[PDB]
């Protein structure tokens, strides 16, 4: 069995050597001449109240107007950000909700948590009262995330080291992704839905093919867990955050890390990440109660969205890029412009 | 557009009139997490109070709502799914004294890890020791040998506060009290009065297990209130 270990370590050395060979210049060196974006002093423009406990996740809507948020008091609330009016209220069966999603067709919203179950709700019921449509079961550990591909396909990640894909109509699994030694804490569909990348609790991020139910690559470089992940808008890269208080960017083609964002004063862990529509900015939530805007092409900090009284646990940006949003353990949301 | 705005305002008014009702029930309920090693007799306690990735048990003491969540069907990697409970009244922590490879050291390290956790420097923790009779049997028959796994058990001296139950063998009392102080050597370092530990002794089938947690919840709430007023 040892010969297998020698083969594995030799393959690891080969992959490392190939990555080094493909490494000639750094992203900062290439972008050493671009202009700085300047000080980005945003300011709140709304504030939504009604969540009893800490907001653990929120998702936008495809129209950039509505949004859905989830708290650990057992409640889903769909706010109209323009008028800040509650449209729906849904009492969850499992109070320990840990994620939420908004269907692209704006008709369904899904959530999951410590009960291992993913539940689907219908927004356009004939009677108008929101009720459970289909319950998806089959995981053996808290569900750390979920996303929609269309009105019928939903992709989910769990704390059992496996990502699963589902057919909502029948309720049966269609694929099972495996290969993570640690819990998967997030994922993000590609812009064209071809691929999806998940980061897990071993400092490794794995890229998959949604159809063949197989793995494609594996990115490493972090020193601790990975709590957040998201695709760059063009779909050719992604970035993540880790408990080592650093953010990084990995290019699919390069198969290696391009740059790392860090600062001495920062000694806390990131909890969320997102890009802007143009892809020239990068936000992230810290447990120090401060968000931060990192210049993607310069790695220098360009601002801070201070104003939360407690840990930042989620974040989001509209498709059109008009309004950021953030939740926190203080139980209040804040729209930023 | 005026009619649509009026309809939206009415819908929001109904939603808020429902959320105000909801806010009145979530404030009259206590959230308690029930930890405990696998072989700690944890379930026997739950079976007493009652008489999927999480099991929920609801009860009430003197018309006070309690909410007790039992973990299950989860991997033994705790350092992430544990943060969800940073807002609980108190985390029950059952243990077996007869544990003494030796599960007692594992429980000691786990309790220390909980204590020194940042998201939980404000989440009080209750402590049980649920293998008292087993410890008594193991020490009576000479099979204790606690000195082997602890180089300081024969040089320990019983505290002056001992109030032993009838028929208690001095050696049994000394040992059982020795077990307690090992954990309390941690719960009195870096405490700073923000959160506390409540040592206790209880058999797995003790009826009073509800009363002890009820009283400890009362004390925690009172202390937090008094600390809001700067009276403590």
């Amino acid at each position: 069995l040892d010969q297998l270990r020698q083969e594995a370590e030799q393959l690891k050395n080969q992959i490392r050597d190939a990555r080094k060979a493909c490494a000639d210049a750094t992203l900062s060196q290439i972008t050493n001449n671009i202009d700085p974006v300047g000080r980005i002093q945003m300011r709140t423009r709304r504030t939504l109240r009604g969540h009893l406990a800490k907001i653990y996740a929120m998702h936008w809507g495809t129209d950039s107007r509505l949004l859905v948020s989830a708290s650990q008091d057992g409640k889903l609330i769909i706010w109209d950000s323009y008028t800040t009016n509650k449209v729906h209220a849904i009492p969850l069966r499992s109070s320990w909700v840990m994620t939420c999603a908004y269907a692209p067709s704006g008709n369904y919203v899904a959530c999951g948590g410590l009960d291992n179950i993913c539940s689907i709700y219908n927004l356009k019921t004939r009677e108008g009262n929101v009720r459970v449509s289909r319950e998806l079961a089959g995981h053996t550990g808290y569900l750390s995330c979920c996303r929609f591909l269309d009105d019928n396909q939903i992709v989910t990640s769990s704390g059992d080291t496996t990502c699963a894909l589902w057919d909502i109509e029948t309720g049966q699994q269609t694929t099972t992704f495996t290969g993570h030694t640690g819990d998967v804490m997030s994922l993000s569909l590609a812009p064209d839905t071809r691929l999806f990348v998940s980061g897990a609790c071993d400092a490794s991020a794995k890229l998959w093919d949604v159809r063949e139910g197989m793995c494609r690559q594996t990115f490493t470089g972090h020193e601790s867990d990975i709590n957040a992940i998201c695709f760059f808008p063009n779909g050719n890269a992604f970035a993540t955050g880790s408990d080592d208080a650093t953010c990084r960017l990995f290019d699919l083609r390069a198969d290696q890390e391009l740059m790392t964002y860090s600062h001495d004063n920062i000694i806390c862990g990131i909890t969320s990440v997102s890009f802007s529509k143009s892809g020239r900015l990068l936000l992230a939530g810290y447990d120090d109660f401060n968000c931060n805007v990192w210049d993607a092409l310069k790695a220098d900090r360009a601002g801070v969205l201070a104003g939360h009284d407690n840990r930042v646990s989620c974040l989001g940006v509209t498709d059109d890029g008009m309004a950021v949003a953030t939740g926190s353990w203080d139980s209040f949301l804040k729209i930023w412009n | 557009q005026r009619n649509e705005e009026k309809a939206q305002r009415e819908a929001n008014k109904k939603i808020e009139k429902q959320l105000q009702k909801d806010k009145q029930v979530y404030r009259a309920t206590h959230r308690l997490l029930l930890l405990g090693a696998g072989e700690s007799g944890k379930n026997t306690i739950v079976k007493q109070m009652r008489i999927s990735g999480i099991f929920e048990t609801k009860f009430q003491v003197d018309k006070v709502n309690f909410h007790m969540f039992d973990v299950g069907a989860q991997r033994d990697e705790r350092r992430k799914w544990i943060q969800c409970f940073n807002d609980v009244t108190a985390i029950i922590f059952v243990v077996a004294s007869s544990s003494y490879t030796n599960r007692l050291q594992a429980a000691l390290k786990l309790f220390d890890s909980i204590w020194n956790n940042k998201w939980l420097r404000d989440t009080s923790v209750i402590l049980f020791l649920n293998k008292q009779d087993l410890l008594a049997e193991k020490v009576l028959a000479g099979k204790s040998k606690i000195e082997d796994y602890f180089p300081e058990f024969a040089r320990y001296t019983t505290p002056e506060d001992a109030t032993p139950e009838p028929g208690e063998d001095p050696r049994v009392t000394r040992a059982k009290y020795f077990i307690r102080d090992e954990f309390l050597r941690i719960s009195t370092a870096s405490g700073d009065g923000r959160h506390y530990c409540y040592p206790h002794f209880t058999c797995a089938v003790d009826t009073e297990n509800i009363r002890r947690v009820f009283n400890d919840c009362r004390d925690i709430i009172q202390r937090m209130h008094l600390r809001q007023y700067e009276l403590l």
Partner: nanobody
Amino acid sequence: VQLQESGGGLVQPGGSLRLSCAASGFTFSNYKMNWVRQAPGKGLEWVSDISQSGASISYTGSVKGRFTISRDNAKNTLYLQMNSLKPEDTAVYYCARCPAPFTRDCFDVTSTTYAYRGQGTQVTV
């Protein structure tokens, strides 16, 4: 992240032996350190740990006064010293690390599938 043990072997009862842990891929100083071993027919059990700078140490009771734990942050290596080994010392020794830096707590080190835990080295008595 990499943790490779070395320096094991065979020793008769009451002998001595030194274990050297070589690590790379992370800044050694910021992370606590642990020694953990597993014996046949039994699950993992904890042995010892050392603070970031070594100012704080602690042992399991049954090992107290026998072994010694020391870390050389300048050489990003950890050490364990063996003396007066009893028959029950036969086991593999895993060189471990805490998940998050700058923290006092340390979770999951004795877990069945901890991620940052070396392959271990064998000591037989």
